[PDB]
Design a protein around this motif. Structure first.
Motif, PDB file in Angstrom:
ATOM      1  N   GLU B  44       0.753  -1.186   0.032  1.00  0.00           N
ATOM      2  CA  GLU B  44       0.000   0.124  -0.067  1.00  0.00           C
ATOM      3  C   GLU B  44       1.118   1.418   0.077  1.00  0.00           C
ATOM      4  N   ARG B  45       1.758   1.431   0.833  1.00  0.00           N
ATOM      5  CA  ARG B  45       2.818   2.510   0.936  1.00  0.00           C
ATOM      6  C   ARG B  45       3.451   2.815  -0.395  1.00  0.00           C
ATOM      7  N   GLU B  48       1.475   4.210  -3.499  1.00  0.00           N
ATOM      8  CA  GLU B  48       1.429   5.762  -3.153  1.00  0.00           C
ATOM      9  C   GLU B  48       2.407   6.618  -3.476  1.00  0.00           C
ATOM     10  N   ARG B  52       2.913   9.892  -6.197  1.00  0.00           N
ATOM     11  CA  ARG B  52       3.356  11.189  -5.828  1.00  0.00           C
ATOM     12  C   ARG B  52       4.326  11.599  -6.869  1.00  0.00           C
TER      13      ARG B  52
END
Lengths: 48, 62
Positions: B44-45, B48, B52
């Motif tokens: 999940e991290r 992301e 970004r």
């Protein structure tokens, strides 16, 4: 009182122990296998 | 009687042992859920981060 009471009772006490040890190992067995297959689903899912 | 003693030395061990092995079969299985969850928390991290970084790059580029 015959020796047959304790004799033929002993040879059942041994069967009760044996099933105990069996279904202890045959239970943990399931969990270890289920832990592997779960973390495969977590890899299969995660890369896709 | 005497055969009733015999059934009680067994009937005691065969619950001590089988209670112990249903809490290892619990324990392995609890850690197995808490690992899969955490290998997806790091997944999940990561995704992301990549998004970004990605957008900032395309803003600068353009």
């Amino acid at each position: 009182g015959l020796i047959k009471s304790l004799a033929e009772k002993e040879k059942q006490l041994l069967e009760r122990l044996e099933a105990a040890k069996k279904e202890a190992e045959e239970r943990v067995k399931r969990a270890e296998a289920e832990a592997k297959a779960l973390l495969e689903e977590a890899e299969a899912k995660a890369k896709a | 009687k005497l055969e009733a003693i015999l059934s009680q030395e067994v009937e005691a061990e065969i619950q001590a042992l089988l209670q112990e092995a249903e809490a290892k079969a619990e324990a392995v299985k609890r850690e197995a859920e808490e690992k899969a969850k955490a290998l997806l928390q790091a997944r999940e991290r990561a995704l992301e981060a990549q998004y970004r970084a990605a957008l900032r790059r395309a803003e600068s580029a353009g």
